[PDB]
Amino acid sequence: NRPAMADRQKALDERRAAREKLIE
Amino acid sequence: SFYVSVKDKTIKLNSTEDVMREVSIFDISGKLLYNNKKVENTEFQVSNFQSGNQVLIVKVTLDNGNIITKKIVFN
Amino acid sequence: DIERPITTGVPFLLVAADARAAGLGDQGVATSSDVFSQQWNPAKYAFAEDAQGLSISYTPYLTDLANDISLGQVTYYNKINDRSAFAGSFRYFGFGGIELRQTGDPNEPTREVNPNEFALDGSYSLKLSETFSMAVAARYIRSNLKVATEEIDASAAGSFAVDVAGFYQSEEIAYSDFNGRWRAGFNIQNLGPKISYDHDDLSANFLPANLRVGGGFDFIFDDYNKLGVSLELTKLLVPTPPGPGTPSQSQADEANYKKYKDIGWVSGIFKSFGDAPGGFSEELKEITYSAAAEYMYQDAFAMRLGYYHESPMKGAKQFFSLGAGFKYSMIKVDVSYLFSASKVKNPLENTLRFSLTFNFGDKYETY
Ligand SMILES: CCCCCCCCCCC(CCCCCCCCCC)(CO[C@H]1O[C@@H](CO)[C@H](O[C@@H]2O[C@@H](CO)[C@H](O)[C@@H](O)[C@@H]2O)[C@@H](O)[C@@H]1O)CO[C@H]1O[C@@H](CO)[C@H](O[C@@H]2O[C@@H](CO)[C@H](O)[C@@H](O)[C@@H]2O)[C@@H](O)[C@H]1O
């Protein structure tokens, strides 16, 4: 037709990277 | 139609065609300073020494349970 | 009961003036940044999520006895950059209009007096690091509670004070069961010269200089549920007056009061600390504390429990507090209620505090 802690930490890291990259 | 007057440390209630049943005078602290259940549209002499307090609250209960509230300055 | 309370001028400055902090046990130094964060901790105005905010707060007094006797607050904040913010707040305690009447032809013109007490302050907050911020505030206090009569002068008494605040807010940190957040705060309040109610230097009252130190933690579950637990400690920075005797019966008390009242406010700040032959435990009786829990759903519903404890030796203000908050689109409504647990009657018992804030402007992301 074209371990919740680890997931939460990955989501936080992705949010941090995206917020850092978007403004610059 | 209701008036409270203070001339010389004396409280004077005036009601037009309305007769009061009870009067209560409170301080700003909420302490009951005076209470009379036999109001006759007359004057009231509360103790003159109030430790620097001037503002008083007068609650008047009429024939019916209606309550009239007046803030006065005790002078 | 209350043995040797600390006597300060303009005590109305110590009353919580917003429903959100009132519902959290009269604490705001380490809670989340909001529009009311001027009486508690201006330093978190730099951590605001909205660019500009306005707020109106109403705290009625003696609701059963009379109307119009209340403490109102109007706050405005504007954060210009992502690092700095300006704020201005105005607190006003009033009895409402009071008519001065003699019988004297009751159609005669009458004089209306409004005895009041207000404080107007402006604060600047700047973020030093990404997690820490500081703030400096300047406040003008005026007291006009006296009514002019014969042999009574009703000139207002004024004073100035400064505020130094600091706020730390960490980033979201993932743990085993939740990804919480850490907060800390301090606020040194009401640092200024003594207020003279009678306009005489010999008869002056200390400003209620205060120190608030607090810390909080946010349990974040499901991205829609939050539980903020906050703890605050408060100490008055005013010297304690002499008591029964500190070695001619009344002469000793007169001399002790003479030496106590002849203390500068700057020196009084340091004299508040220590001044006891005992250790930390003996001085712990001058520390008030408060513990608060705020549940937050979708950042739109808030449910607040609080406990405020003074030592019954001074003040005797011990109570539990209930609070609720709602956010429709840009309008936030807070209500708070108090259950007293002290022997002395709390003037704010059976009273529902109201708060209403409008948020507008740009939105800032939270680090
Ligand atoms: C003098 C003393 C203060 C009076 C100033 C009045 C200004 C009103 C601001 C209204 C406010 C807060 C209101 C809540 C606070 C009230 C609390 C009261 C409590 C009382 C107890 C949101 O209110 C929004 O409500 C929206 C309705 O849904 C409307 O959107 C409008 O629909 C269409 C129009 O029909 C329009 O096409 C559409 O573009 C709008 O989006 C607007 O009314 C407004 O944007 C502010 O938010 C925003 O408003 C705008 C201007 O609109 C402000 O821009 C600046 O305004 C002047 C700056 O000073 C400058 O001149 C101006 O150059 C500058 O652009 C910003 O501030 C901005 O952040």
From TrEMBL, chain A:
The domain of life for this entry's organism is Bacteria
Q: Which family does it belong to?
A: Belongs to the Skp family.
Its protein name is Periplasmic chaperone for outer membrane proteins Skp
Q: Which residues of the whole protein does the chain here span?
A: 172 to 223 of 341
TrEMBL record, chain B:
- The organism's superkingdom is given as Bacteria
Q: What is this protein called?
A: T9SS sorting signal type C domain-containing protein
| Organism, scientific name | Flavobacterium johnsoniae (strain ATCC 17061 / DSM 2064 / JCM 8514 / BCRC 14874 / CCUG 350202 / NBRC 14942 / NCIMB 11054 / UW101) (Cytophaga johnsonae)
TrEMBL record, chain C:
Name the Pfam families on file. PorV
List, alphabetically, the InterPro entries matched.
PorV (IPR045741), T9SS_OM_PorV (IPR047799)
Which residue intervals define the domain Type IX secretion system protein PorV in the entry? 1-242
Q: Which UniProt keywords apply?
A: Signal
Under the heading NCBIfam families, the entry gives: PorV_fam, T9SS_OM_PorV
Protein's recorded name: Type IX secretion system protein PorV domain-containing protein
Protein's organism: Flavobacterium johnsoniae (strain ATCC 17061 / DSM 2064 / JCM 8514 / BCRC 14874 / CCUG 350202 / NBRC 14942 / NCIMB 11054 / UW101) (Cytophaga johnsonae)
